[PDB]
Design a protein around this ligand. Structure first.
Ligand SMILES: OCc1ccn2nc(-c3ccccc3)nc2c1
Ligand SMILES: [Mg+2]
Ligand SMILES: [Zn+2]
Length: 313
């Protein structure tokens, strides 16, 4: 009850910042997450015995893939913590609980392959879930872990609060499907500009939480350049492996996934920042002004990719 997690001074201070990197010490990541739950939600939100057992089972069900791994889970949860802490009064007790767990669980059992590769392979998960294939799997895996004996961190919620929190987590995890992001942001753009955006409208909150999830999910483009640049290697190691596996099905992959076309990556990163990342953090900044540091860091990293192309690095 009276047992806080306390981080070393440099982490205690930097963890409050959007651009915080959780570091290379894996054994510190569970404590970093509990710390964030305690400050974001409260020390009463979860039974520490159950939370700790939930965290370690979530960890175990992330695979040793280059990018979509346990470190990504905790990184995405930290970005959400930073958004919730800079927007104190906009989010309910249930939403603060649901969203940190949602981010931690959002890529459970990822194999490092896209929804497209599952469909072209004809993977069983592509027959069980026709759209947002991996994301429905990620939510499925979250529910499984919640139902392990001693793992139900939500046991103290009423029946109706329990249903609301699982519904928040489900929508949050589905929203991490980048194919759904484009239409969600376009709708949020219209609503903000015509002035119809209303945070008491549940369908509107849903969309705003969706954008937050995309923002947290892409947060590696909002770090200091060296973090962003070295994380890019990890994401491309998965892309190129998927490209290799496309060639083994006798399908030439898109150039982004073809390790024979590494030269095209700087230009492909520009397209990604311009088409996806910058618009995402722009709309998020309009809806939640205190999240402007994410947009600023993202523009700084666009400029750094522009310098790569111009041969300045
Ligand atoms: O630097 C870290 C980083 C983080 C996330 N993503 N996601 C992409 C991406 C996703 C789809 C298409 C193209 C690029 N690139 C990056 C780079
Ligand atoms: Mg995902
Ligand atoms: Zn993710």
């Amino acid at each position: 009850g009276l047992m806080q997690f306390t981080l070393p001074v440099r982490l205690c201070k930097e963890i409050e910042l959007f651009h915080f990197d959780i570091g290379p010490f894996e054994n510190m990541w569970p404590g970093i997450f509990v710390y964030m739950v305690h400050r974001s939600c409260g020390t009463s939100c979860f039974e520490l015995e159950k939370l700790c057992r939930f965290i370690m089972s979530v960890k175990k069900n992330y695979r040793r893939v280059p990018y979509h791994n346990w470190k990504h889970a905790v990184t995405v949860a930290h970005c959400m913590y930073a958004i919730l802490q800079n927007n104190h009064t906009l989010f309910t007790d249930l939403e603060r609980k649901g969203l940190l767990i949602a981010c931690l669980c959002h890529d459970l059992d990822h194999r490092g392959f896209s929804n497209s590769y599952l469909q072209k392979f004809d993977h069983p998960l592509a027959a069980l879930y026709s759209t947002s294939t991996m994301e429905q799997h990620h939510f499925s895996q979250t529910v499984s872990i919640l139902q392990l004996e001693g793992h139900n961190i939500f046991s103290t919620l009423s029946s109706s609060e329990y249903e609301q929190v699982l519904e928040i987590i489900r929508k949050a995890i589905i929203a991490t499907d980048l194919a759904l992001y484009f239409g969600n942001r376009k709708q949020l753009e219209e609503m903000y500009q015509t002035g119809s955006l209303n945070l008491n409208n549940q369908s509107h909150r849903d969309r705003v939480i969706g954008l937050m999830m995309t923002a947290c999910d892409l947060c590696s483009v909002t770090k200091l350049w060296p973090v962003t640049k070295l994380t890019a290697n990890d994401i491309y190691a998965e892309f190129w492996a998927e490209g290799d596996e496309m060639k083994k099905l006798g399908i030439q992959p898109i150039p982004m996934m073809d390790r024979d076309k590494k030269d095209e990556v700087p230009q492909g990163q520009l397209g990604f920042y311009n088409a996806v990342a910058i618009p995402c953090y722009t709309t998020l900044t309009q809806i939640l002004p205190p999240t402007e540091p994410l947009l600023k860091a993202c523009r700084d990293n666009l400029s750094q990719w522009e310098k790569v192309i111009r041969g300045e690095e």
